[PDB]
Swiss-Prot record, chain A:
This is Large ribosomal subunit protein uL18. One of its GO terms (biological process) is ribosomal large subunit assembly. CDD domains: Ribosomal_L18_L5e. GO terms for molecular function: 5S rRNA binding; structural constituent of ribosome. Keywords: Ribonucleoprotein, Ribosomal protein, RNA-binding, rRNA-binding. The lineage of its organism: Archaea, Methanobacteriati, Methanobacteriota, Stenosarchaea group, Halobacteria. The gene is rpl18.
UniProtKB/Swiss-Prot annotation, chain C:
One of its GO terms (biological process) is maturation of LSU-rRNA from tricistronic rRNA transcript (SSU-rRNA, 5.8S rRNA, LSU-rRNA). Pfam families: Ribosomal_L30. Part of the 50S ribosomal subunit. Binds 5S rRNA. Keywords: Ribonucleoprotein, Ribosomal protein, RNA-binding, rRNA-binding. The keyword Disulfide bond does not apply. This is one of 5 proteins that mediate the attachment of the 5S rRNA onto the large ribosomal subunit, stabilizing the orientation of adjacent RNA domains. Residues 123-144 have a biased composition (Basic and acidic residues). This is Large ribosomal subunit protein uL30. PROSITE patterns: RIBOSOMAL_L30 (PS00634). Residues 114-146 are annotated as: Disordered.
Curated annotation (Swiss-Prot), chain D:
PROSITE patterns: RIBOSOMAL_L5. Pfam families: Ribosomal_L5, Ribosomal_L5_C. GO terms for molecular function: rRNA binding; structural constituent of ribosome; tRNA binding. Part of the 50S ribosomal subunit. Interacts with protein L18 and the 5S rRNA, and probably with tRNAs. Forms a bridge to the 30S subunit in the 70S ribosome. It comes from the Archaea. This is 1 of 5 proteins that mediates the attachment of the 5S rRNA onto the large ribosomal subunit, stabilizing the orientation of adjacent RNA domains. Forms part of the central protuberance. Modeling places the A and P site tRNAs in close proximity to this protein; the 5S rRNA and some of its associated proteins might help stabilize positioning of ribosome-bound tRNAs. In the 70S ribosome it is thought to contact protein S13 of the 30S subunit (bridge B1b), connecting the 2 subunits; this bridge is implicated in subunit movement. The gene is rpl5. This is Large ribosomal subunit protein uL5. It comes from Haloarcula marismortui (strain ATCC 43049 / DSM 3752 / JCM 8966 / VKM B-1809) (Halobacterium marismortui). GO terms for biological process: translation. The lineage of its organism: Archaea, Methanobacteriati, Methanobacteriota, Stenosarchaea group, Halobacteria. GO terms for cellular component: ribonucleoprotein complex; ribosome. Keywords: Ribonucleoprotein, Ribosomal protein, RNA-binding, rRNA-binding, tRNA-binding.
Swiss-Prot record, chain E:
This is one of 5 proteins that mediate the attachment of the 5S rRNA onto the large ribosomal subunit, stabilizing the orientation of adjacent RNA domains. GO terms for cellular component: ribonucleoprotein complex; ribosome. This is Large ribosomal subunit protein eL21. The keyword Lyase does not apply. Belongs to the eukaryotic ribosomal protein eL21 family. Residues 1-65 are annotated as: Disordered. InterPro entries: Ribosomal_eL21, Ribosomal_eL21_arc, Ribosomal_eL21_CS, Ribosomal_eL21_sf, Translation_prot_SH3-like_sf. HAMAP family: Ribosomal_eL21.
Length: 186, 160, 154, 140, 95
RNA sequence: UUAGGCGGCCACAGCGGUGGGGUUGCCUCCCGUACCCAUCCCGAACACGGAAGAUAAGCCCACCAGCGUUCCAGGGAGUACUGGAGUGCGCGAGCCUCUGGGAAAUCCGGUUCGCCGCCACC
RNA sequence: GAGUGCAAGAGCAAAAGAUGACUUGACAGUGUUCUUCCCAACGAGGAACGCUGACGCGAAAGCGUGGUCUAGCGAACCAAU
RNA sequence: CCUGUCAAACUCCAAACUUACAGACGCUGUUUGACGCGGGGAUUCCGGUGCGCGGGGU
């Protein structure tokens, strides 16, 4: 910008979407990164590997293609998160992938956060990932219990669109159940 | 002391004052001369004094010559005639002297000189077509007080 | 294809230069070798430029010399059409000479000593203190300029 | 267009730059929430040598907590012109400052893919006077 | 020299041109070389760890196994063979 | 790639500016604090929950060279400097010829307002 | 352009700086390599990089073999421990 | 804005050139055994000059 001496940050640093100091510590394990990413209405889970001209995504999972299996609820919450992870973790398994390290990107390691949820799900998909069982949300909050109890304080439906009134964390079970299943077209 | 002791440009460039101290003041009174408010573009004739050999000129000579030159212009063109001469080189090179024999012989700072590569313009005066033979004379006296031989070369001016 | 002729001695000659000259099969003043024109070969003659005389000789001239100064890889045997014939891939001196200039083979590939040990220039040379452009004898030459030397040292 | 461009108060800070306390009290009651110790940097001949040490306090108000402060705050002041920031902000007064900006400031305050607000979307002194003035009082 | 430390006279070689200033990319710091591969030695001014003695900048050794994460690269100093412990961050593949 | 995620090279990508773009799609801003989590004070941020509204930001798309940068043409310049050679010149400082290399500033005109890999996606 | 204990040169910006909290890896053992001493033999000393053991922190990859890098050091004999 | 100069301990630039490794040609080695390894014996550690580049010094 200013002159010839001026130092322009690396592009993805300008954009502020990649933390390189953390990316380096990540790459060190040598294992594939389990990219945990969120969106206002969605949550993505990628299993990335290093490559000659950039990274290679061997398996992914987006909260949107979650309904492709029966989901009929929102796609930016905990049950959604865990599930997206399990899905990606499954496809991951299918790809030959076995172990991975959690890349939560620019997100915060807040206990019980959706990422750890994404992580919990992938781990359950049979993937080995250095984790910490008690930094994860308790099984119930993953189900989506905190949400159903919030609509309990109904008066006005927590959900605009039509999908129950008090909500269904069972749907969560039904879906996990569906994936754990051997058949299911991945 | 003799210019023989400092006229050659064989030593390294010694100017970094952040390391040199006790450097004597430049005897050069002033570089800008004549009517320093008017411009060199305002003059038809432009004559420069060119040093024909690459050398070093101690500030004592720059002043000595620059003096006897402008001093003349003043005499022939009044103290405010319509001319303006300029000394474009400055004494940046610091000079030392080892004034104990050759033991700890690095010298002590004694002066400053200006390195002029042969072919450069030590002086450049600007005047009107009539004073030209005066500005030339101011230079014939100036080149008599510096180590090298010079050329009095007319720049803009074929009104001869 | 150029003809190299060392015209200056080894004393005081830079070593990396002398070694190059030796790599070009020349070990004595007045010795001549036939070098091809390659990036690599030009790189070397450039480095030797100041202690040698070189250029491309005429078929005719090359023949006079090959005849007069060529030798086997060992022995006195005079190289002549018959020799050339009974030993080389050619029918006569000319047949060889043509191959050298056309850079199809080398004095070596034909059991010939890489060097043509010439005789001092008859009538003397143009001096070893100046190049050709200054009237000296060092450096690159005309196909005619080289011939005068080669033939003077015939 | 208008909707996602009309001003809004993001924060109203109220602090007291003392110089060496019992002030946190009033700021608490006056605003409606807890204050914040204010430390300083660099040693000062005015017996203010201690670097890290309480020297004041402040309170950052947001939403209702902030308006419900201005509704009584603003009155006690005779807003002027030279009193406005270039970003369309302004301070007056015990100090009280008002931070103003349009509906998309989060873009420059978040963590992920943050970005500074384009000038053509920044607020202006004029545009500031408007919104505020248009709320129970007068300008200059 | 006035002193004889490892960084003596390394003002030039162990410094970055202004635009190369700042944290270097992670890709080349994780590079995986194979034994036998010819590599170029050049300390990265921005990378603190994994360096080798400056004298060897410019060398082109041969990866011959590694130690921990760093690599063990064989080179020849003048006429003496030496083994240099260096991380990828300061290495480039020849060709 | 009708707006996505991870990157490689790390300004050719920076700085500045203009135009265009989104009813159950995307990214957002946005709405909102029961919960996980959160502020040395603020649900601002962080975290969680969600769609009433919006395309004004950001972002994606098209484009502008004024500044910065990359490369190229011509001019500067085969100049400056320089590896090799000289019973060439010069009181000397230094210069010169032959041989092999060869800038920099500046000016003028082009270029450049990123390119590329992987994955996902009416 | 700040700062990073001290020369000078160098390194660093979601940090190597600042603030906060927690912590004692300034740990024990044993090596590889470079340096000391370019090339090219030579001790003490130094550094880089490993392993073993035990620990600190972190969600985790990971980081910690003192201070961002290059100065701050000492044989035998004897003593004490 | 305009205008006048500099840097051994300045650098947005920047050679020639020196240098690591590899290939190619050359040259060389495989009865003249190169490259290298092990061992025995030294001498030597007052140098000087020209040229180029230097630092000090009239
Ligand atoms: Cl994210
Ligand atoms: Cl080393
Ligand atoms: Mg014979
Ligand atoms: Mg005779
Ligand atoms: Mg003669
Ligand atoms: Mg240097
Ligand atoms: Mg728009
Ligand atoms: Mg350290
Ligand atoms: Mg004793
Ligand atoms: Mg004791
Ligand atoms: Mg050198
Ligand atoms: Na004495
Ligand atoms: Na004179
Ligand atoms: Na860097
Ligand atoms: Na406090
Ligand atoms: Na927009
Ligand atoms: Na040692």
């Amino acid at each position: 910008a200013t002159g010839p001496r001026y130092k322009v940050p690396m592009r993805r640093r300008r954009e502020a979407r990649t933390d390189y100091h953390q990316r380096l510590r990540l790459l060190k394990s040598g294992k594939p990164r389990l990219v945990a990413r969120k969106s206002n209405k969605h949550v993505r889970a990628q299993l990335v590997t290093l490559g000659p001209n950039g990274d290679d995504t061997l398996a992914s999972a987006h909260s949107s293609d979650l309904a492709e299996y029966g989901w009929e609820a929102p796609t930016g919450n905990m049950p959604s998160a865990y599930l997206t992870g399990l899905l990606a973790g499954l496809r991951a398994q299918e790809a030959g992938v076995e172990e991975a390290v959690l890349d939560i990107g620019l997100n915060s390691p807040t206990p019980g956060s959706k990422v750890f949820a994404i992580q919990e799900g992938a781990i359950d998909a049979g993937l080995d990932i250095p984790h910490n069982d008690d930094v994860l949300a308790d099984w119930q909050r993953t189900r989506g219990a905190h949400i159903a109890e919030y609509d309990e304080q109904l008066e006005e439906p927590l959900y605009s669109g039509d999908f129950d009134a008090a909500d269904l964390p069972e749907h969560f079970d039904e879906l996990r159940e569906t994936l754990l299943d051997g058949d299911i077209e991945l | 002391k003799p210019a023989s002791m400092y006229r050659d440009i064989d030593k390294p460039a010694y100017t970094r004052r952040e390391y040199i101290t006790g450097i004597p003041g430049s005897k050069i009174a002033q570089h800008k001369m004549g009517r320093k408010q008017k411009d060199a573009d305002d003059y038809p004739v432009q004559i420069s004094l060119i040093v024909e050999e690459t050398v070093q000129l101690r500030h004592g000579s720059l002043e000595a010559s620059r003096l006897s030159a402008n001093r003349h212009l003043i005499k022939e063109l009044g103290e405010e005639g319509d001319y303006k001469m300029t000394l474009r080189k400055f004494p940046h090179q610091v000079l030392r002297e080892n004034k104990d024999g050759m033991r700890a012989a690095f010298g002590k700072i004694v002066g400053t000189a200006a390195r002029v590569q042969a072919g450069e313009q030590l002086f450049t005066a600007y005047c009107n077509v009539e004073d030209a033979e005066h500005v030339k004379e101011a230079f014939r006296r100036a080149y008599n007080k510096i180590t090298p031989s010079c050329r009095i070369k007319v720049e803009r001016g074929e009104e001869l | 294809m150029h003809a190299l002729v060392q015209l200056r001695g080894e004393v005081n000659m830079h070593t990396d230069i002398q070694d190059t000259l030796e790599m070009l099969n020349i070990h004595h003043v007045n010795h001549c070798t036939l070098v091809p024109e390659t990036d690599a070969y030009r790189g070397m003659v450039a480095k030797v430029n100041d202690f040698v005389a070189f250029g491309e000789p005429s078929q005719e001239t090359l023949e006079t010399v090959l005849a007069t100064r060529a030798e086997p890889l060992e022995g006195d045997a005079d190289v002549d059409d018959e020799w050339v014939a009974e030993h080389t891939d050619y029918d006569d001196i000319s047949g060889l000479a043509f191959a050298l200039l056309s850079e199809e083979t080398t004095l070596r590939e034909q059991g010939l000593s890489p060097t043509l040990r010439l005789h001092p220039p008859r009538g003397g040379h143009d001096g070893v203190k100046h190049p050709v452009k200054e009237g000296g004898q060092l450096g690159k030459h005309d196909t005619e300029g080289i011939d005068d030397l080669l033939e003077a040292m015939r | 267009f208008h909707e996602m461009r009309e001003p809004r108060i993001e924060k109203v800070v109220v602090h007291m730059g003392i110089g060496h306390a019992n002030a946190e009290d009033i700021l608490g009651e006056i605003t409606g929430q807890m204050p914040v110790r204010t430390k300083a940097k660099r040693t000062v001949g005015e017996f203010d040598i201690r670097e890290g040490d309480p020297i004041g306090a402040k309170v950052t108000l947001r939403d209702e907590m902030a308006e419900e402060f201005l509704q009584t705050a603003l009155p006690l002041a005779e807003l002027a012109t030279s009193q406005f920031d270039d970003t369309g902000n302004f301070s007056f007064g015990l100090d009280v400052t008002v931070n103003l900006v349009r509906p998309g400031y989060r873009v420059a305050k978040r963590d992920k893919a943050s970005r500074s607000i384009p000038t053509k979307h920044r607020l202006n002194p004029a545009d500031a006077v408007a919104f505020i003035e248009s709320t129970y009082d007068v300008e200059v | 020299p006035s002193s004889n430390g490892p960084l003596e006279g390394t003002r030039g070689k162990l410094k970055n041109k202004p635009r190369d200033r700042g944290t270097s990319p992670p890709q080349r710091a994780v590079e995986e070389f194979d034994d036998g591969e010819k590599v170029h030695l050049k300390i990265d001014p921005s990378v603190p760890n994994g360096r080798f003695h400056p004298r060897f900048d410019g060398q082109t050794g041969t990866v011959e196994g590694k130690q921990g994460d760093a690599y063990k690269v064989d080179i020849v100093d003048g006429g003496k063979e030496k083994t240099i412990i260096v991380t990828a961050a300061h290495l480039r593949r020849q060709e």
